[PDB]
Amino acid sequence: LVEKLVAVDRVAKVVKGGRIFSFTALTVVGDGNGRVGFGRGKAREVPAAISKALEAARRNMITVDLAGTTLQHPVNARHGASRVYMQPASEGTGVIAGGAMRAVLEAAGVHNVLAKCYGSTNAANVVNATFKGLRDMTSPEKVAAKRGKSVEEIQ
RNA sequence: UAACUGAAGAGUUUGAUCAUGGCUCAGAUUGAACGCUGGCGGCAGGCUUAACACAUGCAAGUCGAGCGGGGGAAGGUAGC
Numbered sequence A: 001l002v003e004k005l006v007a008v009d010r011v012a013k014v015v016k017g018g019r020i021f022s023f024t025a026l027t028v029v030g031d032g033n034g035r036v037g038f039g040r041g042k043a044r045e046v047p048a049a050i051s052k053a054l055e056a057a058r059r060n061m062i063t064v065d066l067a068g069t070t071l072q073h074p075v076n077a078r079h080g081a082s083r084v085y086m087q088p089a090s091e092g093t094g095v096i097a098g099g100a101m102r103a104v105l106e107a108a109g110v111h112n113v114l115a116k117c118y119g120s121t122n123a124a125n126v127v128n129a130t131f132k133g134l135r136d137m138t139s140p141e142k143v144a145a146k147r148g149k150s151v152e153e154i155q
Numbered sequence B: 001u002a003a004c005u006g007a008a009g010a011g012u013u014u015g016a017u018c019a020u021g022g023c024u025c026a027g028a029u030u031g032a033a034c035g036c037u038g039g040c041g042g043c044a045g046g047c048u049u050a051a052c053a054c055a056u057g058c059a060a061g062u063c064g065a066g067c068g069g070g071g072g073a074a075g076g077u078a079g080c
């Protein structure tokens, strides 16, 4: 189970006589064969935040139906002000995407893809958008099943 | 046989945050210029500004089988 650490930030909370500082971590876990999830963790110190983020990531996971090592069809997704576009690519292309998308795609097992961010590039929002796009991607078998047809009829 | 296959982000407003929005950076390119330095070859390129003013040499001649004159070389004959 591959685990990637997307971002770590230091945050502050004001109290009387000073500020309380903490750390937040965003992590993405995956199996490289169509299962992936992400999570966040907050703690007074970095390792505990990373562990909590990993625990949340393992709790929040989905299954993604890949077409080989690439996507089934072009995907448009958004979460808040972050919009993402993803496109299938031929073998040998690689993962042409930003780091936040790249972690999710590699953990899900995508090897060739072309991706783009529009709008805000906040790491958590971009991860949410990519996660939604991968979750909502469909496949020819599901399309044929829902239309009451055969995959050869669907083409 | 083949003639196309293609899209990455980062920094910076706040005690944290998310958004909006400018500014800045990583690329490719050049008839370039300047600074430091400098061995060779091949192939290209070389006043982007004053269509400002130009010394000097050269860059449009050739035909005597179109024509009449006119020149200067030799030869031969003659004499002394």
Ligand SMILES: NCCC[C@H](N)CC(=O)NCCC[C@H](N)CC(=O)NCCC[C@H](N)CC(=O)N[C@@H]1[C@H](O)[C@@H](OC(N)=O)[C@@H](CO)O[C@H]1NC1=N[C@@H]2C(=O)NC[C@@H](O)[C@H]2N1
Binding pocket: A078, A079, A080, A127, A128, A129, A131, A132
């Ligand atoms: N917001 C705070 C509200 C406070 C407000 N004051 C309330 C109030 O005043 N009156 C009450 C009125 C309530 C209202 N009638 C119900 C309502 O809001 N319906 C709409 C919201 C649906 C649902 N509730 C939220 C939801 O499904 N989120 C998921 C979630 O975050 C996460 O997936 C999971 N599973 O974890 C993520 C992928 O990681 O996908 C998100 N999905 C999405 N992201 C996308 C996005 O942004 N745009 C476009 C589309 O693509 C979106 N879908």
